[PDB]
Design a binder for this molecule. Structure first.
Ligand SMILES: O=C(N[C@H](CO)[C@H](O)c1ccc([N+](=O)[O-])cc1)C(Cl)Cl
Ligand SMILES: O=C(N[C@H](CO)[C@H](O)c1ccc([N+](=O)[O-])cc1)C(Cl)Cl
Ligand SMILES: O=C(N[C@H](CO)[C@H](O)c1ccc([N+](=O)[O-])cc1)C(Cl)Cl
Ligand SMILES: [Co+2]
Ligand SMILES: [Co+2]
Ligand SMILES: [Co+2]
Ligand SMILES: [Co+2]
Ligand SMILES: [Co+2]
Ligand SMILES: [Co+2]
Lengths: 213, 213, 213
């Protein structure tokens, strides 16, 4: 299959996993600003567009760390070999959104092909989930391009055993010499500590500062 | 009556409404900074005070968009023709607050009269709700004038079917050439998407940048 | 004992206490930036390290206000005469954390001795709670030194009657001429209003701006 059952008995976080899963169930969100000054220049020198690139970069970073690809399957903790981004798409005509997903590829060009293809096929589809059920191996990404925010948090009535990270981006803004993008990350404490989230954000910042290809 | 039953069957968000109301109940909060540089100048050229003006402006913006004035009445989704602000008042003497409400008016001067009148009558009343039950057609506004914040979120143990927006303002501060006011907006996802919140904030920013009368 | 039963019947917030405890149970979080420019200079002129000093200062501020030291004991509302900080410690080797506590002292030097001693004894212990049960009279402090954030919020599935404040600090950063530290405070609304949180933050800022000894 496309996942491995994780070895919980020998895991250094096994106590923390049971503690935050069942004793004191909780998750947290944090919003930090990523410097996209370099990324903006790379985009300017290319034909790629901002949203799909960010989707690719966030998916790439998630795909590097096991703790961001955990799930419960058949009552056991698993790690997905890879996850595909599920992202929101806004319909200007109805002023409503849909969620779509497309397969992740470490090849940026192949990822763009996948994206444009899904976009082409469902750009007019106003169902919340035009493709039907969300792939189990997913990450959620959403964008609020119309307003800048310093914080964002989702208040969910029940998040039992839901371990996929939730990432939300706001409109970027110029802050002196830098172009900053607010990015909110929301995780379940059973699989992620503050260290793991910081590590993800640091890695994303490095990717934004690196060549696209 | 002062409300209309909304046409849920023909609404473009009908799927989203059922989804976020019952399948995955959730709400979100976001804090953004409004530029009040212009507003400060308009206030300086007038006799109006900051808090009541902000209350008026937030109420005016809410009163423009239907999705911010929804409620469930007799198990059906309704839109209030208009909502009145319910705002917090601090008592320096007991270091406690009360919540008061006064009727909204599109006439700023008539609104100020309503405000001062409610303030006059209950300035000494330390009950949490001096006027008794909160009007059903309300919006909540609160102020924390003593500290600046970049984020604010309310963790509510049960928010089933509570659709009135919650707005919280912090102490404003000078940020280079601008005077910025942190404003947190917290809504239920069944009636509001990120688009709707951004639209509200953008409209509020425009009102702050416009003549008072 | 080390606590006093609080006089709820004569308290000015008695209505608010019942309201936010049982009618509309909720808490809130806020993140604000503390200016640590002066503190950094005091630290530079000393042998004290940043983390333990912040722990001391946060504990000192908490120890000054009764509303931050409330709890329910034997179904009654009590105030602890004093609380000890419970703080997180990261283990670089396992990339996991533990929580430790040490007795508060108004004497900074005696506090440092207590801290170093607990640190010495459990630096290698990877249990989540190396010392065993958390003292009932505690405050929680956590640090995310690896990333700066503008917001942080804990989404807790059940926080009934849990009144100890939760404080989270991020990596500090230079903001023009100032060194700013993001600090998130999360409280239960039954015992703390926005005023009380602002008062705590203002007092902490004053302590950071004052001599250590
Ligand atoms: O609901 C979704 N997205 C919204 C868009 O505002 C938001 O990002 C979200 C994501 C996950 C979530 N959850 O898993 O509880 C709730 C809301 C996707 Cl699952 Cl379609
Ligand atoms: O409780 C209230 N206000 C507080 C003040 O801190 C806060 O703004 C708030 C508003 C709404 C809320 N809710 O509806 O769950 C909870 C807290 C008003 Cl309802 Cl009186
Ligand atoms: O769980 C704890 N700390 C974490 C570390 O991320 C976090 O600060 C936290 C604190 C309190 C909490 N609560 O009381 O619900 C939940 C998480 C301490 Cl209780 Cl050990
Ligand atoms: Co268990
Ligand atoms: Co891989
Ligand atoms: Co239903
Ligand atoms: Co109207
Ligand atoms: Co009761
Ligand atoms: Co004392």
């Amino acid at each position: 299959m496309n996942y491995t059952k994780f070895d919980v008995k020998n895991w250094v976080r096994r106590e923390h996993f049971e503690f935050y899963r069942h004793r004191l169930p909780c998750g947290f969100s944090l919003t930090s600003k990523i410097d996209i000054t370099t990324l903006k220049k790379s985009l300017d020198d290319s034909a790629y567009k901002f949203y799909p690139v960010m989707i690719y970069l966030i998916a790439q970073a998630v795909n590097q760390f096991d703790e961001l690809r955990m799930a419960i399957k058949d009552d056991e903790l698993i790690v997905w070999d890879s996850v595909d981004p599920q992202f929101t798409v806004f319909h200007q005509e109805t002023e409503t959104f849909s969620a779509l997903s497309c397969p992740y590829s470490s090849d940026i060009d192949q990822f763009m092909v996948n994206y444009l293809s899904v976009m082409e096929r469902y750009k007019s589809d106003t169902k919340l989930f035009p493709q039907g059920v969300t792939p189990e191996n997913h990450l959620n990404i959403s964008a609020l391009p119309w307003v800048n925010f310093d914080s964002f948090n989702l208040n969910v009535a029940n998040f039992t055993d839901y371990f996929a990270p939730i990432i939300t981006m706001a409109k970027y803004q110029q802050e002196g010499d830098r172009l900053l993008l607010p990015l909110s990350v929301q995780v379940h404490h059973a699989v992620c500590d503050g260290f793991h989230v910081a590590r993800f954000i640091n890695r994303l910042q490095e990717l934004c500062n690196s060549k696209l290809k």
